[model samples]
Target: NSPTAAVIAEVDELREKIKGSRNSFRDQSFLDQLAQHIADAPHLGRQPIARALVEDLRGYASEPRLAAVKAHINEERDQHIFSLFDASYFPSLSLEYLTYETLPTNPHLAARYASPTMPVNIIASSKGFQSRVVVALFPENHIDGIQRGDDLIFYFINKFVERHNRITRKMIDAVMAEGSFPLLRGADDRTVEQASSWWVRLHEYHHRQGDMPIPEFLRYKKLKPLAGLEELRVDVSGMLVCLNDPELPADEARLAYEYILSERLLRYAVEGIPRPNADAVASQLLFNYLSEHGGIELHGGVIRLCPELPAVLTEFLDRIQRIEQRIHTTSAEEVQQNLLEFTNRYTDYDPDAKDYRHIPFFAEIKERLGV
Candidate 1:
């Protein structure tokens, strides 16, 4: 007799289909039903789950609305291929999974791709889509990542217009006006798109080394601090690769740094509150490291770049690697202390924060994705 009961049953069937098949995206009939049910249920009409459903509903939705999203994503993907890699390039890229729907994968990759809006994954597809080299993107949201113009800036303005306090809103506006670094000046659709594409390619280059396993000591337990350390490792490693690649243009290298810098600005601006995600924490720590080591400076309340950025970045990467290696040998308490010693040297980090507490892996996902 309960109306919601029928909805729940439909969702159960969808889950069953998902569990039964490896390529659920190929099943048009199931996708159609999945889309119809999600459209009918208000609770399933938002991010995470909503992102996946929208892909399935592309065939079912009004033409202009859904078609435009698909075209835009496909166009971007095409540009990434054409603009970045020459045909002579040997990696054999396959972007078949570059759509809105999140495909089934281990928790690591699933969460990586699902967290961002308009997410894109670049893989080493010599063996097809399941290749070990994976890079994720969220070109739709500036806070998650960015693309041409002040789209991310305006997104912040509209998203918080009604909810933000006067001071917080004004702070966000100031950040928007400042924009990314001077290197990002004159940015438009094509330039920004290329920059973003390069960023993902950089990550893909790291993943090409093969799947770096999470340390057994750090797995299952919540070491937000440790996760922050690992994220720093990947970013620093990728940055080094990009910097050292003689084939990469200087302009592209600068844009990559600008994109990274913009994310750092977004983290501390807006509400200026601590983020629950370890990656966010890692970004702030990196920002501080840059400021302290002569790669950047805070001048008149704005971030300014230094000529010594590359050297400083390399030094920071070396230090982070040493710390990360030591963490594998240390106790959880020692791990917390070691990271705090380094991170707190630059910013006002508080271990007492709720986000700093050690929750297990499954619990963290449940809280993070509301799954």
Candidate 2:
């Protein structure tokens, strides 16, 4: 069956009501589905309809796929969580909506978490899973939910891994020799998406490690440093996993590393300028630390990685672990002193009444971008 012309007409307004109520991140709006509803109103639009128009065209073979995804999630969630992390953790989830399909909400904390990726992905991918790592569907729009395989990561990459976050020759030309870590051949978007998925899942795993609970950091007000340090630590942790894990494909590993560095470090400093997000702060922390420790360099205009990149990252990784280990159930500022100091050392924290002028080499990039 195709979409109802009458329904599609009403959807322009009804769909806008679909998001936001579903999650915590707040700018609730869903407009694009209406456009898609107009474009491919059955007269079609996968395995794909769950991503869009599931409400109009319910339960095709797509039902089986959704069921299988939820089943695998329940089965795999605990297995991976306990084994992947350096510990023993209990499994958890209440599957009222095992094949959970509905309107979507922000996966990361809306704009506050990552502005661009906000309003998309809702709880799709394992990235969204709160108590249990999940792969839910939010067909609120044609931008829709994700599917098995790299759909999770690709859906994000199509959104999160944008040109701003993408690595290009010009960006790399500044530092490394050309094609030092070239893109995987002929894989098209799959290779980068695959590598990113691996990077993210592993990143999530590392968050489960260590004595200090990441959730504890979420509880506090001055959370940026804690978040930044933990982010840097796990970023290295994700990198280390891909770098050495036997299961990860070698080409994929290198791609993951390249993307992490390219997007996180190279782009983040410029992006952070006036106000820094947690990840951007972490980027600044890593950039300064790595630059000092010989992992990377800013010899002239562009940057370059030291041969000791792995060694330096591993060292910094350990350093972050040590700092995290020191936080006893204490005052947020007092207990977080080391990390706050370490992070600020690398970042220019403009916390006060500062009608700040543009600063630093990023100024070059800013003026160059002409925005």
Best by TM-score: 2
Give Cα-based local distance difference scores for all models: 0.43, 0.46
Give the TM-score comparing model 2 with the true structure, all chains together.
0.59
TM-score of each: 0.47, 0.59
Error of 1 at 32 (Å): 15
Worst 10 residues of 1 by lDDT: 80-89
Go through the candidates in order and give the C-alpha RMSD of each one to the true structure: 15.6, 12.2
Q: Per-residue lDDT for 184-277 in model 1, tens only?
A: 5555544545444444444433422322323334362245545665656656666665567555566677666565445433432222122436
**In model 2, which range of ten residues has the least summed lDDT?**
79-88
